[PDB]
């Protein structure tokens, strides 16, 4: 006649991490639509002739 | 010739086991819809991070 706190609830229970980091995020797709340009200062300026 | 119909008429037979295992049962399928998580106590508690 063990008291409920020390029962299947807590005393008899094993922790498992099968659900961890299983639901993923949508795959990255920004490369297909955008291109990467590096920078090394506060801003970047672009110019073309015509 | 003449004989009781409970000895010869009963023993003039050849038992065969063709009918055994003639049919089958539906194949296992729960693998395609479930994973197997072994347990070592009364219950298993699961926890994952957000």
Numbering used by the authors:
A (entry chain B), B (entry chain C): 2 to 51
Question: Which statements did the authors publish about this structure?
Answer:
Bacteriophage Casadabanvirus JBD30, from the order Caudoviricetes, is a temperate phage that infects the bacterium Pseudomonas aeruginosa. The virion of bacteriophage JBD30 is composed of an icosahedral capsid, long flexible non-contractile tail, and a baseplate. Using its baseplate, JBD30 attaches to Pseudomonas aeruginosa via the bacterial type IV pilus, whose subsequent retraction brings the phage to the bacterial cell surface.
The icosahedral capsid of bacteriophage JBD30 is built from 415 copies of major capsid proteins organised in a T7 laevo lattice. The classification, performed as a part of the single-particle reconstruction, identified two classes of JBD30 capsids. One of them contained minor capsid proteins whereas the other lacked them. The major capsid protein of JBD30 has the canonical HK-97 fold common to tailed bacteriophages and many other viruses. The major capsid protein can be divided into the N-terminal arm, axial domain, peripheral domain, extended loop, and axial loops. The capsid of JBD30 is formed by pentamers and hexamers of major capsid proteins. Contacts between the pentamers and hexamers are stabilized by the interactions of extended loops, peripheral domains, and N-terminal arms. The extended loop of the major capsid protein stretches over the peripheral domain of the neighbouring subunit positioned clockwise in the same hexamer or pentamer. The three peripheral domains around threefold and pseudo-threefold axes connect either three hexamers, or two hexamers and one pentamer via interactions of α5 helices to form a phenylalanine lock (Phe192). The N-terminal arm extends from the major capsid protein core, protrudes towards the neighbouring capsomer, and forms a small hook that reaches above the spine α-helix.
